[PDB]
Design a protein around this ligand. Structure first.
Ligand code: HEM
Ligand SMILES: CCCCCCCCCCCCCCCC(=O)NCC(=O)O
Length: 455
């Protein structure tokens, strides 16, 4: 029954590494997958992994009793500043489970209902900016989505105003974040990481990190002595004790969690909104249908928590977007013990598998032949979607803890955008996906014509 795993051109000791050599890795890995099937091996200096593309195999990979979350080289490098923060820590390290039980309660239907008003605050700013543009001006979508998602997480999770709508250029923190992330993704290429040439990178990496820290310092400083009568993420982060250890998160960790949530809590949500708006302008009828919904439901100056939850179709657009381009391209797992995958590929305790989510979301045995066609209607009956065929948010216990937070925000913002403006792809934008571990539409710009609706 055994069938051995294929793999791309060998290329000496550098391994399969040269098959990439690009700032658009994932997109290359997708092409490779189009050739080699549902699975292939990928090697590099001191590491090896198998890339999965089918729901058949990924369905097994998602078996928690057999495979656990693995820190891919990517997250390993990303850890140089994130540390044992929920996203970059191992499932077994005390810190993960500890922080998980302590922070999770900040994502209940309760905390969410509390966040809404704050989400609206920032949502109003974004609508306001656009309302105030002059005729000859246009909008830089990703840039503004980043101002939103970032300001939203800062307000809701730390009661700190980044005030990105009062800045001409990306807030200093963002400039450093995207550079640190870019550095990490590019480091997966570097054949010899300590060789002089990269002395600039190291010099600059410690710098960008300091920037992020300084930001944290100022946040863990602003809370220090103000109306601390608020109970948000940062609150239950300093006044939270693990119900099974009586031990709260120490200083070193609380730091990492903030830096963790500030990045994981906006960057990919920024991309979602960007791709969503991208697909809406390139698919007029779909945009129309959603516009119809946004207006029919959002009948007040500001959206109510209930009204957002009613934005069914808007929510479908968001999933269809995440399907084609999951802003978090992949997550990895390793075999907990020795086992056989799909009854054909033998694996050894420790071996790691890599989930190529974009490809997973294109398996024609799950979605059909029009996989590249943008159809929100696909999510009409969520119950019918096969188990583990749609995974924009990771898997199991190590799945996105911010999922509801993100989808509620994106739904709110997209619903309002659609309520207050008509959109125009005035340059017939050509989709250019920029990679920095995550995915976003580079240089996507549009013009927006107000429908002139109050607030
Ligand atoms: C649409 C936007 C988002 C996407 C697509 C996304 C994607 C993901 C994915 C795929 C994982 C799994 C990582 C892995 O297996 O290595 C994850 C984990 C995580 N996400 Fe999200 N995320 C989004 C928004 C958010 C938001 C808004 C927050 C913050 C409030 C957040 C916080 C986290 C954290 C803390 C983890 C670690 C969970 C754990 O292991 O306990 N994410 N996310
Ligand atoms: C709190 C910090 C959150 C940071 C978010 C990081 C984003 C998660 C997406 C991980 C994407 C990994 C993509 C790996 C693809 C790749 O380049 N493979 C080649 C290789 O690993 O050698």
């Amino acid at each position: 029954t055994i069938k051995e795993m294929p793999q791309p051109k060998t290329f000496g000791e550098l391994k399969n590494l040269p098959l990439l050599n690009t700032d658009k890795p994932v997109q290359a890995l997708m092409k490779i997958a189009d050739e080699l099937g549902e699975i292939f091996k990928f090697e590099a200096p001191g590491r090896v992994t198998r890339y999965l593309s089918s729901q058949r195999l990924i369905k097994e990979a998602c078996d928690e009793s057999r495979f656990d979350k693995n820190l891919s080289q990517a997250l390993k490098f990303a850890r140089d500043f994130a540390g044992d923060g929920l996203f970059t820590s191992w499932t077994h390290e005390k810190n993960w489970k500890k922080a998980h039980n302590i922070l999770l309660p900040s994502f209940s239907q309760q905390a969410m209902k509390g966040y809404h008003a704050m989400m609206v605050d920032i949502a109003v700013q974004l609508v306001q900016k656009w309302e105030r543009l002059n005729a000859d001006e246009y909008i830089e979508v990703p840039e503004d989505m980043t101002r939103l998602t970032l300001d939203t997480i800062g307000l809701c999770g730390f009661n700190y105003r980044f005030n990105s709508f009062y800045r001409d250029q990306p807030h200093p923190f963002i400039i450093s974040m995207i550079r640190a992330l870019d550095e990490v993704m590019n480091k997966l290429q570097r054949a010899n990481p300590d060789d002089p040439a990269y002395d600039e990178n190291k010099r600059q990496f410690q710098e960008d990190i300091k920037v992020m820290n300084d930001l944290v310092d100022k946040i863990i400083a602003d809370r220090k002595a103000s109306g601390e009568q608020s109970d948000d993420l940062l609150t239950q982060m300093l006044n939270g004790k693990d119900p099974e250890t009586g031990e709260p998160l120490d200083d070193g960790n609380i730091s990492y969690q903030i830096i963790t949530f500030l990045i994981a809590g906006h960057e990919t949500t920024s991309g979602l909104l960007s791709f969503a708006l991208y697909f809406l302008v390139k698919n007029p009828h779909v945009l129309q249908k959603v516009a119809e919904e946004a207006t029919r439901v959002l009948v007040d100056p500001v959206p109510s928590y209930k009204q957002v939850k009613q934005l069914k179709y808007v929510g479908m657009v968001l999933n269809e977007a995440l399907r084609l381009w999951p802003t978090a391209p992949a997550f990895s797992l390793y075999a907990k013990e020795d086992t056989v995958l799909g009854g054909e590929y033998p694996l050894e305790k420790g071996d790691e598998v890599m989930v190529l989510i974009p490809q997973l979301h294109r398996d024609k045995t799950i979605w059909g032949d029009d996989v590249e066609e943008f159809r929100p209607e696909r999510f009409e009956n969520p119950s019918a979607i096969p188990q583990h065929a749609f995974k924009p948010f990771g898997n199991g216990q190590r799945a996105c803890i911010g999922q509801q937070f993100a989808l509620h925000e994106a739904t709110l913002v997209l619903g309002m955008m659609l309520k207050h403006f008509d959109f125009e792809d005035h340059t017939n934008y050509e989709l250019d996906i920029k990679e920095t571990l995550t995915l976003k539409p580079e240089g996507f710009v549009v013009k927006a014509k107000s429908k002139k609706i109050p607030l």
